[PDB]
Design a protein around this ligand. Structure first.
Ligand SMILES: CC(=O)OCC1=C(C(=O)O)N2C(=O)[C@@H](NC(=O)Cc3cccs3)[C@H]2SC1
Ligand SMILES: *C(=O)[C@@H](NC(=O)Cc1cccs1)[C@@H]1N=C(C(=O)O)C(=C)CS1
Ligand SMILES: O=C(O)Cc1cccs1
Length: 259
């Protein structure tokens, strides 16, 4: 059975809608599955917000060390790092790290607020040539992931192209690119997702998302030992609002497209 047939079968048995875009940077070849369909990004959108702040830092050498005050009233539904810092400060760099490596929603909201709102994240994506990405809401509501809702969505192909540019391409100056990569490589939330479908010793940087409608996402850059990098987006969503998340489906998709 072909890769396409395998993805079709995985999707059908899983009881959802699967979106996959793999870019092989060895030859610029692609494996696409529903790659032009919109999906709710959920917390994968934090990559774009963190990168937007990194872009700003290219013209302000003091930005990443700027103090941000964390109040009790800033806490939302999931904030394992920010809650440790209530009544204190975190730097913008520390907020980027917390957002990316722990999926701290308070940290995401501080990045968005610093930028001037969700629309500023959209404008940053557009500045990278991504005509597809849109950020409309803050956390937690950006994770509602309602079928057919365009808010806070992108397509697998658009996100793969932009993640490639961010991490391996033209988007950021070198120090900032390297910082983004360091953050992604140190993610703690992705064990059971794309990483689980790959050789254990491959280096991976990724950002997950989990939302309503059992929406389960991961976007990754993958560094094989003897090959050029791969960029992989796996998005998955289901028909029932209260559905369980399905990290294993992302692992399976990763295994299929790297087999
Ligand atoms: C850490 C995490 O939450 O993993 C997602 C998950 C997955 C997955 O795909 O990774 N799922 C499974 O493999 C499903 N588990 C079951 O269907 C087992 C059952 C439990 C209760 C009745 S059936 C769901 S249970 C939830
Ligand atoms: C990002 O996806 C974010 N998800 C949520 O806050 C969950 C919801 C909020 C409203 C409806 S559902 C955080 N990300 C992680 C992750 O990266 O997977 C989570 C596991 C949940 S918190
Ligand atoms: O407590 C407040 O309302 C303001 C803050 C100062 C420092 C962290 S939060």
């Amino acid at each position: 059975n072909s890769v396409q047939q395998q993805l079709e079968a995985l999707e059908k048995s899983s009881g959802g809608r699967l979106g996959v875009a793999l870019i092989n940077t060895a030859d610029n070849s692609q494996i696409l599955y529903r790659a032009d369909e919109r999906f709710a990004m959920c917390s994968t959108s934090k990559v774009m917000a963190a990168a937007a702040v990194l872009k700003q830092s290219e013209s302000d050498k003091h930005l990443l060390n700027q103090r941000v005050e964390i109040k009790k009233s800033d806490l939302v539904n999931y904030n394992p790092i920010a809650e440790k810092h209530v009544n204190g400060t975190m730097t913008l760099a520390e907020l980027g790290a917390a957002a990316l490596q722990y999926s701290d929603n308070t940290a995401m909201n501080k990045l968005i607020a610093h930028l001037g709102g969700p629309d500023k994240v959209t404008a940053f994506a557009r500045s990278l040539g991504d005509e597809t990405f849109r950020l409309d809401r803050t956390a937690p509501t950006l994770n509602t992931a309602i079928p057919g809702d365009p808010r806070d969505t992108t397509t697998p192909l658009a996100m793969a192209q932009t993640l490639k540019n961010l991490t391996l391409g033209k988007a950021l100056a070198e120090t900032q690119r390297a910082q983004l990569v360091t953050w992604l490589k140190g993610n703690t939330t992705g064990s059971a997702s794309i990483r689980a479908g790959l050789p254990k010793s491959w280096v991976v940087g990724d950002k997950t998302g989990s939302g309503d409608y059992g929406t389960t996402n991961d976007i990754a850059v993958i560094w094989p030992e003897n090959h050029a990098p791969l960029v992989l987006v796996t998005y998955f969503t289901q028909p029932e609002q209260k559905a369980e998340n399905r990290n294993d489906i992302l692992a399976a998709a990763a295994k299929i497209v790297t087999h």
